[PDB]
Amino acid sequence: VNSFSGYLKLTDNVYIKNADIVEEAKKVKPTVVVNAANVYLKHGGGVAGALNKATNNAMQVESDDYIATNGPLKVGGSCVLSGHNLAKHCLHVVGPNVNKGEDIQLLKSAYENFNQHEVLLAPLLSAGIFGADPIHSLRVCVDTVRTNVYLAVFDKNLYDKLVSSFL
Numbered sequence: 001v002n003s004f005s006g007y008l009k010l011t012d013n014v015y016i017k018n019a020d021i022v023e024e025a026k027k028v029k030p031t032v033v034v035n036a037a038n039v040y041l042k043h044g045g046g047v048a049g050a051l052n053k054a055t056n057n058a059m060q061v062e063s064d065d066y067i068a069t070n071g072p073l074k075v076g077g078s079c080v081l082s083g084h085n086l087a088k089h090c091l092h093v094v095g096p097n098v099n100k101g102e103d104i105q106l107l108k109s110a111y112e113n114f115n116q117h118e119v120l121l122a123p124l125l126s127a128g129i130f131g132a133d134p135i136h137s138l139r140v141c142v143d144t145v146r147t148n149v150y151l152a153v154f155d156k157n158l159y160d161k162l163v164s165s166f167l
């Protein structure tokens, strides 16, 4: 039993809800919140900009130190950093950004990072401003993640479109 509420169950381990991931994280304070990161951990817009804003820029400060020490992530890769006031940990995961010409096949590799954590609150990787088809992202999520994932979808028409189209 966990404290996630109001989710539709899609499979044994995947759940979905129309929700603002910032507000969800503040309420649940999950062990792991997933950020839709880029390789530079520059949290400017989309989910990343919103999560960072909610931390009063502490996420960005921590991230800049991480990059200065370690260099950029790989597309498809991840790192674990602090969750600040939102969660115990933030798993920064880099899905391919279609608006940069990155290979959509890397989306499966990106979701594989979730399997290192028993339970996660997450967005759909590569959706929104990363330019991928969210129906595809949900399919890859369901077919790749084996741990318990609670997906927060910001857009209602999409949330409704994702549910009604889910196979």
Ligand SMILES: C#CC[C@@H](CO)Nc1ncnc2[nH]ccc12
Pocket (backbone or CB within 6 Å): 019, 020, 021, 022, 036, 046, 047, 050, 123, 124, 125, 126, 127, 128, 129, 152, 153, 154, 155
């Ligand atoms: C809109 C749209 C697409 C998705 C990424 O696929 N963006 C988000 N998903 C969930 N919570 C969010 N908070 C702020 C942004 C955001």
Ligand SMILES: [Cl-]
Pocket (backbone or CB within 6 Å): 045, 046, 047, 127, 128, 129, 130
């Ligand atoms: Cl977005």
